[PDB]
Amino acid sequence: VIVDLKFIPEEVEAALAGAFPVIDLADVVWKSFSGGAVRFVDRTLTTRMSEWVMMQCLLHLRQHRAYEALAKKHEWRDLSQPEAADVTVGIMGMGVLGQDAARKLAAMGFKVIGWSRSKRVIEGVETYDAAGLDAFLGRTDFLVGLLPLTPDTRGIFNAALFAKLSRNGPFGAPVFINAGRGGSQVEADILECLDSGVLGGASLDVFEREPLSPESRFWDMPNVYVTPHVAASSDVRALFVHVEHQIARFESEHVV
């Protein structure tokens, strides 16, 4: 089997031991069977994404940066701490990813509301539509972006949207979390809102131009968490089980 994948080479090399019981062209294609989304539909992407989203909401809720700054000073000091039920997480995007995250955040105690341009009826979650966007934003303390990039979501996360987020929550200023696509945000507005305090903090997994430039100001900011577009990663061992099975079945799905 020909393997030409621009993934982590060590993870590919390691995953070949056992797989296809192998012309590895770094010595099945992704920037040379597709390596990602005959396509590969990795069933673990949703649950992986929800781990990242949950982690961001907890990092912000539990004041991780303030406690780490105290730890760096070797200073023992308890801070006033809201519970998850004191914070409304507003999720823009009520597809598979938004629905999974909503359910899990609510089970952890967060108040959760959802938004999509056209109304969706989601069991257990109050949802808002385009006409209800202002009301949705005004209730939201932690804004979570799980939207696709379409013409309707180009630069949707912008200065005016951030200015309509709630300032009535326990931190007095909203937080922005995005793991959809960088084209959905106006990065200059995010930076200016962080500098001005309109946004109290952010978690960004996606950027207008990836990989994020080493000169970006996002890297050093005290209340911004940067991840390199890894909210969900495929396991290459899972890809080969998909290729083995589809190679075997063909010898005995998911054609584009």
- Binding annotation for NADPH: 39, 94, 96-97, 118, 120, 179, 205, 232
Q: Which of 34, 36, 129, 216 binds its own copies (CB under 8 A)?
A: 216
| Segment (H or E) for 247 | helix 236-251
Compute the distance between CA of residue 193 and CA of residue 63 in angstroms, rounded to an integer. 19
- Residue 229 annotated among the catalytic residues of the structure: yes
As to burial, measured by CB atoms within 10 angstroms (0-12 exposed, 13-18 middle, 19+ buried), residue 145 is buried
Q: How far is the CA of 251 from the CAs of 28, 40, 245, in angstroms?
A: 17, 19, 10
Site string for Cl ion, 89-128 (x = CB under 5 A): ---------------------------xx-----------
Q: Can residue 44 be called a binding residue for its own copies (CB under 8 A)?
A: yes
> Which residue among 32, 47, 150, 196 contacts its own copies (CB under 8 A)?
47
- Residue of the chain from 168, 230, 253, 254 that contacts its own copies (CB under 8 A): 230
Given the residues 65, 117, 229, 237, select the one marked as catalytic. Answer: 229
Task: Name which position in 22, 26, 41, 107 contacts its own copies (CB under 8 A).
Answer: 107
Helix and strand totals (H; E) in the chain: 8, 10
Q: Known catalytic residue: 181?
A: yes
The residues near 47 (Cβ < 8 Å, ≥ 6 apart) are 100
Alpha-carbon distance of 63 to 60, in angstroms, equals 5
What character string, x for contact with its own copies (CB under 8 A) and - otherwise, covers 56-85? Answer: --xx-xx-x--x--xxx-xxxxxxxx-xxx
Partner from its own copies, Cl ion, none contacting 116, C-beta within 5 to 8 A by type? Cl ion
Size of the site for its own copies (CB under 8 A): 51
**Which one of 133-141, 179-187, 195-203, 221-229 is the stretch in contact with its own copies (CB under 8 A)?**
221-229
Q: Residue 131 has which token pair?
A: 């006409």
Q: Do 252 and 230 meet the contact criterion of CB atoms below 8 Å apart?
A: no
Nearest CB to Cl ion, comparing residues 19 and 125 = 125
Q: Is 10 in the site for its own copies (CB under 8 A)?
A: yes
Dihedral in degrees, nearest 10, Cα atoms 145, 173, 123, 183: -10
CB 230 within 8 A of CB 56: no
CB 127 within 8 A of CB 115: yes
Active-site amino acid positions? 181, 229
Residues that bind Cl ion (CB under 5 A): 116-117
Which residue ranges make up the site for its own copies (CB under 8 A)? 8, 10-11, 44, 47-48, 50-52, 54-55, 58-59, 61-62, 64, 67, 70-72, 74-81, 83-85, 104, 107-109, 210-212, 214-216, 219-220, 225-230, 233, 235
